[PDB]
Design a protein around this ligand. Structure first.
Ligand SMILES: CN1CC(N)=N[C@](C)(c2cccc(NC(=O)c3ccc(Cl)cn3)c2)C1=O
Length: 374
């Protein structure tokens, strides 16, 4: 289908998947972190110790200055920059060129990560969470308006010694998944917000009130490594995961994500660790489906003679974040036109001979609308 875009993502393990883009005329080439959990297109536009290249506005004949500052504080870090527009391309994407808003980052703190090899961020979420407000049109919105690129993109993030993946823009490559695509509704267009209606650890129901799972929201976020869970849910989950994997004991530096666990060679005993399943609201009334990941997703290799891992499930005060530990099991279709998100078993996901990630349905589920926090 879209062979031109397959494998257009790279990254360093635990640093973020970026795509190559060009900004300006003549085109200045940059690496840009793909982030479905934000909605500003912002790039380094002044020297920084962790930047090697950066957007030089004065060298672009198509640069237009909006003459307005943007200040973006995160939990951390933060940056500030200057709003402007310019022509923008994605070389291993659709062969088009669009004019888009760009926040030129001129000062930052604890934002740019050394070794990450990305010089900017492409926020693919919606205008409502854009800075400085929702009147600043996000990149993907501009792309779709100025082109015949359909209003949909799909990400395959691979485990899988450098990470790789594909961002297919405007459609769905059937070679990137197996089995069926199952769709959950986007509850509201800001984050890519979804509703989780059941959680299992090795088939055992976490057995919480379902709105705990989405307190105060659940989102699909390529800009986050971990599966992050609301405090209550997180405690119930690690307790369950601890019980399930009890044949082996681990320092609780481990369950906090501080400490590593290690094993010889390919001696990692995947089978003692439980699978984790989230049920997502389906497109049909009282119908859900479930996605299931392996320890190969939630145990992240840290790079000898031994294999070592960090525990990548962690707690959150801002609701569920389905970051890369989730996404790396699946081909994820962000179907903006139909206001829904699709998941299929990923053709590149890491697993062993006996287990694989799963997408399965349907399951009869009642009162699913009630699982959403207001
Ligand atoms: C809290 N938050 C989350 C999010 N989605 N977006 C940003 C704006 C953000 C800022 C800077 C870096 C990153 N991501 C990473 O560095 C990253 C992403 C994915 C992996 Cl697999 C690894 N690293 C995200 C945020 O502030």
């Amino acid at each position: 289908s879209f062979v031109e875009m397959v494998d257009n993502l790279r990254g360093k393990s635990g640093q973020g998947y970026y795509v190559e883009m060009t900004v300006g005329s003549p085109p200045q080439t940059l690496n840009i972190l793909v982030d479905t959990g934000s909605s500003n297109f912002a790039v380094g536009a002044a020297p920084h110790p962790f930047l090697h290249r950066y957007y030089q506005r004065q060298l672009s004949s198509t640069y237009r200055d909006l003459r307005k500052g943007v200040y973006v504080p995160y939990t951390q870090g933060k940056w500030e920059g200057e709003l402007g527009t310019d022509l923008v391309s994605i070389p291993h994407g659709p062969n088009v060129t669009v004019r888009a808003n760009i926040a030129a980052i001129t000062e930052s703190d604890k934002f740019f990560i050394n070794g990450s090899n990305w010089e900017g961020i492409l926020g693919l979420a919606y205008a409502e969470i854009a800075r400085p407000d929702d009147s600043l049109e996000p990149f993907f919105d501009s792309l779709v308006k100025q082109t015949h690129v359909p209003n949909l993109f799909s990400l395959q993030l691979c485990g899988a010694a450098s990470v790789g993946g594909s961002m297919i823009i405007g459609g769905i490559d059937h070679s990137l998944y197996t089995g069926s695509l199952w769709y959950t509704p986007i509850r509201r267009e800001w984050y890519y917000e979804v509703i989780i209606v059941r959680v299992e650890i090795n088939g055992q129901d976490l057995k919480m009130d379902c709105k705990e799972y989405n307190y105060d929201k659940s989102i699909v976020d390529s800009g986050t490594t971990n599966l992050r869970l609301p405090k209550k849910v997180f405690e119930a989950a690690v307790k369950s995961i601890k019980a399930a994997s009890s044949t082996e004991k681990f320092p609780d530096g481990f369950w906090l994500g501080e400490q590593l666990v290690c094993w010889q060679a390919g001696t990692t005993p995947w089978n003692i660790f439980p699978v984790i399943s989230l049920y997502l609201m389906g497109e049909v009334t009282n119908q859900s489906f479930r996605i299931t990941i392996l320890p190969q997703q939630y145990l992240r290799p840290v790079e000898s003679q031994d294999d070592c891992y960090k525990f990548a499930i962690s707690q959150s005060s801002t609701g569920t974040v389905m970051g890369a530990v989730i996404m790396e099991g699946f081909y994820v279709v962000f179907d903006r036109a139909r206001k829904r998100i699709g998941f299929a078993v990923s053709a590149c996901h890491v697993h062993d001979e006996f287990r694989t990630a799963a997408v399965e349905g349907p399951f009869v589920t009642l009162d699913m609308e009630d699982c959403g926090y207001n």
